[PDB]
Amino acid sequence: KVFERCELARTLKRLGMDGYRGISLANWMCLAKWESGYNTRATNYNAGDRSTDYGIFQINSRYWCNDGKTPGAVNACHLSCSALLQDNIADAVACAKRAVRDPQGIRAWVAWRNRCQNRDVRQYVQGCGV
């Protein structure tokens, strides 16, 4: 499913993402926008290390979910990576919450550093009523 901006903003707020571990909703929006363009079925294979990024937040198979084909991988979210390709983003959100519970927080995603950190991210939630 390809979410429309405000539709996603409202969904994330209801799922309790606003301010989770100190991360504002606009930051989660900026992250989803650059990682997948708000697309839940987005997949990206990393030929370099044999891991694949799954879903709206492009969560990596090496540490977060199990896809069986990634070498020396763990499954911290205790989910099949398939769960991260559903139209319903409940499981993707619970896994993203788990991911930021680590010391790096939202910095774990390099796309966040490049495109969101120190920038004016208000544009991602403006007019959405959240």
From Swiss-Prot:
It is found in: Secreted. Disulfide bonds join C6-C128, C30-C116, C65-C81, C77-C95. It catalyses: Hydrolysis of (1->4)-beta-linkages between N-acetylmuramic acid and N-acetyl-D-glucosamine residues in a peptidoglycan and between N-acetyl-D-glucosamine residues in chitodextrins. SMART domains: LYZ1. Keywords: Amyloid, Amyloidosis, Antimicrobial, Bacteriolytic enzyme, Disease variant, Disulfide bond, Glycosidase, Hydrolase, Secreted, Signal. Its main location: secreted. CDD domains: LYZ_C. GO terms for biological process: antimicrobial humoral response; defense response to bacterium; defense response to Gram-negative bacterium; defense response to Gram-positive bacterium; inflammatory response; killing of cells of another organism. The active site is at E35, D53. One of its GO terms (cellular component) is tertiary granule lumen. It comes from the Eukaryota. It is an enzyme of class 3 (hydrolase). GO terms for molecular function: identical protein binding; lysozyme activity. InterPro entries: Glyco_hydro_22 (IPR001916), Glyco_hydro_22_CS (IPR019799), Glyco_hydro_22_lys (IPR000974), Lysozyme-like_dom_sf (IPR023346). Its EC number is 3.2.1.17. The keyword rRNA-binding does not apply. The keyword Cell membrane does not apply. Monomer. It is linked to Amyloidosis, hereditary systemic 5: A form of hereditary systemic amyloidosis, a disorder characterized by amyloid deposition in multiple tissues resulting in a wide clinical spectrum. AMYLD5 primarily affects the viscera, and the predominant clinical features are renal dysfunction of varying severity, and intra-abdominal bleeding. Inheritance is autosomal dominant. Belongs to the glycosyl hydrolase 22 family. Lysozymes have primarily a bacteriolytic function; those in tissues and body fluids are associated with the monocyte-macrophage system and enhance the activity of immunoagents. Lysozyme C is capable of both hydrolysis and transglycosylation; it also shows a slight esterase activity. It acts rapidly on both peptide-substituted and unsubstituted peptidoglycan, and slowly on chitin oligosaccharides. This is Lysozyme C. The lineage of its organism: Eukaryota, Metazoa, Chordata, Craniata, Vertebrata.
